[PDB]
DNA sequence: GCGACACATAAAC
DNA sequence: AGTTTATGTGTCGC
């Protein structure tokens, strides 16, 4: 009934069938790494301003709640909250250089103001793109939003038992034990050791992410999850990192910038998941059925 | 098949 | 040690 696996970091992911088997909401079996991530493709090239030098990416994804490995194939429920975690890395960079430094785009050189994520689902037989949901802790008593682009400098993905330790904190000691993982506060640094031009310096708030945590994400309640001849759907999600420039022919979405005006995410690079099912609200997705 | 409201139960503190 | 929080899911009414 119970099929396990061991992570990365010794924790367990505990892969079960809400079909089958009914867990209380809040049980550690419902943390659990969901299927890898592989590569769509490399887009624009990022150059070093004065050595010219390439800059290497890579995402660094993880699914840590939401889906079941049941029979060669990963489930998740339309109901139920899913989360996915990215960072990305630069291996030819230390951080410490790379946020001192300053970066154009090879398309002819655009000069990149910082790095974000995004996350989309598609139907992953069309392209199609399809709508995801955010909630807050307070679910239908508080605000429900679209999950937004993440600025982030370069980190390592915290472990699985981190993101599960980390999820519902509220405490003021925890959060501190916490944010030095998850934040960079730029106001805390020596002002003095940076250029005018520096990356740091063009990131548009003070708190940096280190870690894009989408957290209590579904998606849309409006989506089929059967084809019309009754197959499953397959979906995928997937990770975007890009580079945010100044907008006065290369894959680009408009971003709403923060001193109004409309800037451009420029993709980098694209991960996706393998095809993912969507169990909808139908009784027969549920134990309380049998 | 979906929005809303309800109940239940382990985590968080 | 008890209370509140957070979240899977049961149920009702259209």
């Known amino acids: 009934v119970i099929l396990t696996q061991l992570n990365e970091d010794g924790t367990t992911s505990n892969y079960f069938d809400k079909r089958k088997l009914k867990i209380a909401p809040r049980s ?10 592989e590569l769509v493709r490399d887009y624009c090239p990022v150059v070093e301003s004065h050595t010219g030098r390439t800059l290497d990416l890579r995402i660094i994804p993880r699914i840590d709640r939401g889906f079941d490995h049941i029979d060669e194939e990963w489930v998740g429920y339309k109901r139920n909250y899913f989360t996915l975690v990215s960072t990305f890395e630069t291996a030819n960079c230390d951080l410490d250089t ?12 655009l000069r990149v103001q910082y790095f974000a994520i995004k996350i989309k689902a598609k139907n992953d037989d069309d392209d199609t793109e399809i709508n995801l949901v955010q909630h ?29 330790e980390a999820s519902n904190v509220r405490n003021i000691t925890k959060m501190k034990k916490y944010d030095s993982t998850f934040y960079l506060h730029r106001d805390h640094v020596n002002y003095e050791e940076y250029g005018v031009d520096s990356l ?12 894009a945590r989408y957290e209590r994400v579904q998606f849309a309640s409006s989506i089929s999850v059967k084809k019309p001849s009754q197959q499953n759907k397959h979906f995928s999600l997937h990770v975007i990192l890009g580079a945010v420039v100044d907008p006065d022919g290369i894959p680009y979405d408009e971003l709403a910038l923060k001193n109004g005006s409309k800037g451009m995410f420029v993709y980098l ?22």
């Open 28 to 37: 550690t079996l419902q943390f659990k790494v969901g299927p890898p991530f």
């Open 269 to 290: 690079q694209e991960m996706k998941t393998p095809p993912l099912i969507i169990r909808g609200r139908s009784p027969s997705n549920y134990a309380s059925s049998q």
């Open 200 to 211: 740091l310096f063009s990131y548009p708030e003070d708190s940096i992410q280190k870690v």
């Open 98 to 109: 790379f946020l001192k430094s300053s970066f154009d785009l090879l398309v002819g050189r």
């Open 136 to 164: 807050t802790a307070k679910r239908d008593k508080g605000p429900q939003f679209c999950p937004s682009v993440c600025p982030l400098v370069p980190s390592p993905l915290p472990k699985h038992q981190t993101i599960r």
